[PDB]
Structures are given as structure tokens and as C-alpha cells.
């Protein structure tokens, strides 16, 4: 069932008990966990926090803890599956679920006692009515069964994402009157994480930006003398109309332009004429080459006065109309200034680090620590890692596009990474592969001639384990400016594997990421083709 009053049905219920937190491995989940942790530590709530990265890890942890706890909170996991079947709990256990994944499983929606969903009812949710899915025989009973099959298939075809969990937690904090500035920053970072990964549409992002703008004004608006007397060490959050360039304040403008998928795709910098086009762009700006190649902080201040406006104008002349995005920045001290997307990229790079000296639960701990202002060194280290990852992404995209590795089957495009690829190791982890596939599709759509291939979704495969011969397979929908961001590849994959009898594993919390036995791969794909054409 859905929770109406977060204060009375969830927080007051849990305040007096011991609770177990299962936190998934994404930035939005980390920010939601941060907000909830602050709330719990304010009220002396005894909690245990367990990082989980997949279904097997969650099941193992629940088996380990089911005896010692009665209240569980799942952050960004558990909403799209029948939880009571996967976990097989006791009748007295209660599961609070704060998950962004959609659609919500019908069994979770219609449970009265054990499943409580911390999901806003104003979201995009069209749940089938209870009668049609739960309950002369040929005339009615068989007709009802066939109708249920049809409605359930239609309802569970596309996967998408709802409101950020960090924003839900911030709404809870505001209801309790315990909302601080750090909590608001965490909510902003969660929404920006949703945006950076194309999990939500542009309209939803702008709406939520306005919602957060109101809170920012309420928290940070003061008169002139109040600003004068306020210490520089107190955090300040500001709304900004800033540039799409990635990490440009912690890098050089040239490096940022070369390693941002937006500009890199539109300039075709993987080509030989793309560099000349970039030079023409910079000449149109009037920025000396030696200045744009210098680190942004060291660049002469006179060039920074109107940088955003001039970049917007030049980009408009060059066919880029979306150079400017509404976002937020945080300042503290004399030195420390960050845009939201910079924090998102740093956290992602800390979490998906290729340094295997440390495990993934170890990489999760680093990422969670970096979100606290006491661990600022971790945030700067993550910024450096993000720079390396962006360079690797652009190199891989260039290698894929120059060699014509993106081949169109009938209904979808297929690109496969090989072990001979230099940076393949950086993209073996599923999240990195998903982000790479999205960036690659954007570049390909910008740089292709065939009109049909521009309207196709993408399926991408990369090696996972050379011992078991397993390959990670990801599927993403077509890249369009007004895309609903809805994905049909999870059900398609499950239907292809069933029809062909391949050995597939669903461990990611997203159903569009799968593990496949390499030998079955070929076979699998044909079924998929026949299924989508």
C-alpha cells in the first residue's frame, strides 16, 4: 500500500524502534540515505545501514538480519518486484520502500500489512484496478483471466523513474521542521544525479528545479546587512543558469569542451574536421587559445566576466541551443565552490572506481563519505577520477564510431566491446557501461547520415568475466530531445531468454541490465530481433 502521511505512518512508527537500512549503489540513494541519517541521529534512532548492490546481495543480507529486526527501509530498491516473494519474510515484518523505479509491482501496491511505499501519489502512476488483476467459466472466468494477462502485460511493459528519493526525504525533513541547508544540498544533488543519467525528462527536471528553488530562497535569502554579518564558513546555495560543460571550473575550458558529450558530439571531435570546427568556435568567441588551454581558475579574470552569455551566443551561431541549464551551486569558505553536476560526477567516479585494490562495498563507503563536508579531500579525489573517466569515455566513443562498430539490426542498433579494447576494464561494471552506452548513442545520432538509424534504440554488450564467459548486456531507448525516457528492454530480454532458453541473470535493480553466457549471446540476439521486428 501507499503511505499518505510520512510523519505519522512512517517516521513516528519507526522513531521508537531499531531499523535496518538497505541502500542501493547510486548517487540519489546515497543522498536520500544522508538525509535520513541526519534525521535519525537528531532523534537518537538506533539504525543499521547495509550497502547492497544487487538482488543477490539484498537477499543474502536479509537472510543474515531477518531474525534481529522488525522494521526495514529500502532506499532505491524493491519497488518493481514482488518483495514478499523474493524475501519470504515473517508476517510481522514491515518494509518501508523509498524507491524511484517504476512501474510499482501490483502485489506491492495492494498489500495492507507488510509493504508500505514511500512514494508520492502525485507521480506518474497508472495502476490497474484491484478487481481486474485479482479475484459460465469459459464465458466469464477465462475472459477475465485473458483480460488480466493483457492489462498486466500493458502495465509492465516500460520501465522509467519517478521523483528522486532525496527529494522525498527532504520533504519529510521539512514536514518535521528539521530541514537544514546540508539536507537541501543533498536533495539537489539527488535530483541532479537523476538528470545526469537521463532517468527523467527535461520537463520533470525543470519542475523539480522550481520546487527546489522555492526552498533555496526560503533558506538562503537575507538582506544586505544580514549577508554582510554572516560568516563565510556558513554554506550558501544559489540558483544558477550555468553551462552544460562538465567540470569546467575544475578543468581547462578546452578540456571541458573536448570531454563533454554534448559539445564533443555536436563538434564531432572524434573526426579530423571536428578539431577545426572547435577552433572556429573558439575564434568566434575571441578567447585566446593559450587562455582556454589554461586551467579555468588561473585564467585571466577579464575573460570570465561575461563568459556564460558569450558562450551561449557563439553556441547559438553554431547550432547548439541548449548550452545553458538551470542548476545550483554551493559555496563555503574562501575557496570551496561546487556546481551540483560536479558533485554528481565526483560521487559516481568514487563509486565506480576501477582501482580494484578496494572492493565495491569499499568504493560505496568512499562515495558516501565524500558527501560530508568533513571529507573534502575525497571529493577532490573524486573530481580527478571523474576527469580520467570522461577522457576514457571519449576515447572509447571515438574507437567505436571510427571503426563502424555500431551496426543496425532491423529493430535496434548493436555495439559490442571486445577484450582487445584498451579501456574495456573501465566499462565492465554495469553502471559505467550504461552511462557509456547513452553517451555513445548521443554521439552516434549526432554523427550519422541514415535517417532510420537515428530513431533506433541501442543494445550494448561488454565482457564481464573471462572465467565464466559472461557478458553484460544493456539496452537503452531512442535518443530524442523530447524522449519520455521509457525503456522496454527488460521485458524484451526476459521474453527472448525464455523463448530461446539462454542462461541469463537479473541482478541489477534495473531490469534492462543483464548477465548472459557468451556462447548463448548470438542465439539470444536473434530471438530479440524476431521479438522486436
Amino acid at each position: 500500500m501507499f503511505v499518505s502521511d510520512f510523519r505519522k505512518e512512517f517516521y513516528e512508527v519507526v522513531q521508537s524502534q531499531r531499523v535496518l537500512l538497505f541502500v542501493a549503489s547510486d548517487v540519489d540513494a546515497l543522498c536520500a540515505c544522508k538525509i535520513l541519517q541526519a534525521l535519525f541521529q537528531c532523534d537518537h534512532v538506533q539504525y543499521t545501514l547495509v550497502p547492497v548492490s544487487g538482488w543477490q546481495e539484498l537477499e543474502t543480507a536479509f537472510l543474515e538480519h531477518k531474525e534481529q529486526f522488525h522494521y526495514f527501509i529500502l532506499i532505491n530498491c524493491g519497488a518493481n518486484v514482488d518483495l514478499l516473494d523474493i524475501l519470504q519474510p515473517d508476517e510481522d515484518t514491515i518494509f518501508f520502500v523509498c524507491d524511484t523505479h517504476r512501474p510499482v509491482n501490483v502485489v506491492n501496491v495492494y498489500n495492507d500489512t507488510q509493504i508500505k511505499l514511500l512514494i508520492k501519489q502525485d507521480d506518474d502512476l497508472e495502476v490497474p484496478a484491484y478487481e481486474d488483476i485479482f479475484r459460465m467459466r469459459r464465458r466469464q472466468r477465462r475472459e477475465w483471466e485473458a483480460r488480466r494477462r493483457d492489462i498486466l502485460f500493458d502495465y509492465e511493459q516500460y520501465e522509467y523513474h519517478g521523483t528522486s528519493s532525496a527529494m522525498v526525504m527532504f520533504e519529510l525533513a521539512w514536514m518535521l521542521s528539521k530541514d537544514l541547508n546540508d539536507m537541501l544540498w543533498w536533495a539537489i544533488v539527488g535530483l541532479t544525479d537523476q538528470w545526469v543519467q537521463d532517468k527523467i525528462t527535461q520537463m520533470k527536471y525543470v519542475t523539480d528545479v522550481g520546487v527546489l528553488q522555492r526552498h533555496v530562497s526560503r533558506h538562503n535569502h537575507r538582506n544586505e546587512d544580514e549577508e554582510n554579518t554572516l560568516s563565510v564558513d556558513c554554506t550558501r546555495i544559489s540558483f544558477e543558469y550555468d553551462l552544460r560543460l562538465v567540470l569546467y571550473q575544475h578543468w581547462s575550458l578546452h578540456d571541458s569542451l573536448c570531454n563533454t558529450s554534448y559539445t564533443a558530439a555536436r563538434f564531432k571531435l572524434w573526426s579530423v574536421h571536428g578539431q577545426k570546427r572547435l577552433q572556429e568556435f573558439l575564434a568566434d568567441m575571441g578567447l585566446p587559445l593559450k587562455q582556454v588551454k589554461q586551467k579555468f581558475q588561473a585564467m585571466d579574470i577579464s575573460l570570465k566576466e561575461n563568459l556564460r552569455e558569450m558562450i551561449e551566443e557563439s553556441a547559438n551561431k553554431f547550432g547548439m541551443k541548449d548550452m545553458r541549464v538551470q542548476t545550483f551551486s554551493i559555496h563555503f569558505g574562501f575557496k570551496h565552490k561546487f556546481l551540483a553536476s560536479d558533485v554528481v560526477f565526483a560521487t559516481m567516479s568514487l563509486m565506480e572506481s576501477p582501482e580494484k585494490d578496494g572492493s565495491g562495498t569499499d568504493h560505496f563507503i568512499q562515495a558516501l563519505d565524500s558527501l560530508s563536508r568533513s571529507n573534502l579531500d575525497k571529493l577532490y579525489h573524486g573530481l580527478e577520477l571523474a576527469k580520467k573517466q570522461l577522457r576514457a569515455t571519449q576515447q572509447t566513443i571515438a574507437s567505436c564510431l571510427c571503426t563502424n562498430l555500431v551496426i543496425s539490426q532491423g529493430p535496434f542498433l548493436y555495439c559490442s566491446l571486445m577484450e582487445g579494447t584498451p579501456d574495456v576494464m573501465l566499462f565492465s561494471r554495469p553502471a559505467s557501461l550504461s552511462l557509456l552506452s547513452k553517451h555513445l548513442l548521443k554521439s552516434f545520432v549526432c554523427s550519422t547520415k541514415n535517417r532510420r538509424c537515428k530513431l533506433l534504440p541501442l543494445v550494448m554488450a561488454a565482457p564481464l568475466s573471462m572465467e565464466h564467459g559472461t557478458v553484460t548486456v544493456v539496452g537503452i531507448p531512442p535518443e530524442t530531445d523530447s524522449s519520455d525516457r521509457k525503456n522496454f528492454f527488460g521485458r524484451a530480454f526476459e521474453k527472448a531468454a525464455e523463448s530461446t532458453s539462454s542462461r541469463m541473470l537479473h541482478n541489477h535493480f534495473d531490469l534492462s541490465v543483464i548477465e548472459l553466457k557468451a556462447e548463448d549471446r548470438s542465439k539470444f540476439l536473434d530471438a530479440l530481433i524476431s521479438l522486436l521486428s
Binding site: 531499531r18 541519517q37 535519525f40 541521529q41 537518537h44 534512532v45 538506533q46 539504525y47 543499521t48 545501514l49 547495509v50 550497502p51 543474515e64 538480519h65 534481529q68 562495498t361 569499499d362 560505496f364 563507503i365 560530508s372 568533513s374
Partner: protein, 98 residues
């Protein structure tokens, strides 16, 4: 730890056991019941509760007589300080400040 026990001579182990017994007796004699265990409270207290991260697998750990919690690596717990001080001093838990 057995590693440390290895270096000691047998007579040194006997001395250590005798000293341990004497210290336990003295600590028991201070108060009405159970006395006061002055091996705890080694630093001035700041907060009633603290956040701890498990640095190694340790298994069941009793919070109250009724309830215990499983210590597994890289899990985090919000617990009273007086129940975690000893395991922190032994290198089993780490104190997280945020």
C-alpha cells in the same frame, strides 16, 4: 590475542593472570553492585550516541540482553558510546564523524 600470548613466557602469563584477577577484584569493590569498571571512559565524553563502521567481520554483538546485532565489514551502526568504546579501542570498530 594469541599472537601476543606467543611472545610471553609461561611465568609472565601467570603474572598477567594474577594481575588481571587483582584488578577485577579492586574494580568490583568500588560500588554497591558490580562496582565501577575504570578501564572504560578513557576520554572525556561528548555525545551519548555515535556512528561506528565495522572494520572486520566479528559476528553477533549484544546490544541489550534481548537484542543483538551482526557485525559484518563495512556496515554502519548508530549505537551508545559506552557499548562501542571497547571494540573501538581493539580495532574492531571505527568511529565515524560527519
Amino acid at each position: 590475542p594469541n599472537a601476543l600470548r606467543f611472545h610471553m613466557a609461561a611465568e609472565e602469563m601467570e603474572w598477567f593472570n594474577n594481575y588481571k584477577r587483582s584488578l577485577a577484584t579492586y574494580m568490583r569493590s568500588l560500588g554497591g553492585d558490580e562496582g565501577l569498571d575504570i578501564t572504560q571512559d578513557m576520554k572525556p565524553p561528548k555525545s551519548l550516541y555515535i556512528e561506528v563502521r565495522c572494520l572486520k567481520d566479528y559476528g553477533e554483538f549484544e546490544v541489550d540482553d534481548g537484542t543483538s546485532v551482526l557485525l559484518k565489514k563495512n556496515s554502519q551502526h548508530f549505537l551508545p558510546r559506552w557499548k562501542c568504546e571497547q571494540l573501538i579501542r581493539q580495532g574492531v570498530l571505527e568511529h565515524i564523524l560527519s
